[PDB]
Amino acid sequence: MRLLYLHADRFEYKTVKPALKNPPDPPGEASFGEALVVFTTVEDGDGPQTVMYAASDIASHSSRLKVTTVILYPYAHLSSRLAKPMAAHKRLIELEGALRTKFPGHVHRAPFGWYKSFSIACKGHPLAELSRSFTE
């Protein structure tokens, strides 16, 4: 799993066209104030251990940032070893569930399988942009 942690002042997205025939989540849009935006690329070796490490790390980083909202943002673009779409969707659902056991704020999992538009104002501080890899 490859993640990009963007500490934002604000974030929004809208699904636009479907990127898979039959996206497994319905279309939507949402907008947020301050939030940790986690662009999340699920990779071929990713199982439940990987999901648990990622969830602990996101919770731990969110705490150090003192953020109370996490956006789990499915992203196809951070790796060239992608998990297949059905397995990736499953891992993202597990990550959301795992994060809620460790982190007490708002956890928003954005829909999987769509092209999206988005805007972000990303903060400028030293820990505002970090990347992470998890595996098992």
Ligand X SMILES: Nc1ncnc2c1ncn2[C@@H]1O[C@H](CO)[C@@H](NC(=O)[C@@H](N)CO)[C@H]1O
Binding site for its own copies (CB under 8 A): 4, 14, 16-17, 19, 77-78, 80, 115-126, 128-131, 133
The residue number whose beta carbon is nearest to ligand X equals 19
Q: In the bound complex, what is the minimum distance in angstroms from residue 97's beta carbon to its own copies?
A: 26
Question: Helix axis angle, 85-100 relative to 48-65, nearest 10°?
Answer: 50
Three-state secondary structure string covering 18-77:
ECCCCCCCCCCEEEECCEEEEEEECECCCCHHHHHHHHHHHHHHHHHHCCCEEEEEECCC
Closer CB to ligand X, residue 64 or residue 80? 80
Q: In the bound complex, what is the minimum distance in angstroms from residue 69's beta carbon to ligand X?
A: 18
Q: In the bound complex, what is the minimum distance in angstroms from residue 4's beta carbon to its own copies?
A: 6
Question: What are the residues whose beta carbons fall under 8 Å from the beta carbon of 90, sequence distance 6 or more?
Answer: none
Q: In the bound complex, what is the minimum distance in angstroms from residue 108's beta carbon to ligand X?
A: 14
Closer CB to its own copies, residue 58 or residue 98? 58
With tokens 């279309």, the residue in question is: 27
Q: What are phi and psi of 135, to 5 degrees?
A: -155, 175
Closer CB to ligand X, residue 77 or residue 106? 77
User: CA 50: distance to chain centroid?
Assistant: 14
In the complex, the residues that contact ligand X under the rule CB under 6 A are 19-20, 40-42, 74-77, 82-83, 85, 88, 112-116, 129
Given ligand X, its own copies, none, residue 63, with its beta carbon under 5 to 8 Å by kind, binds none
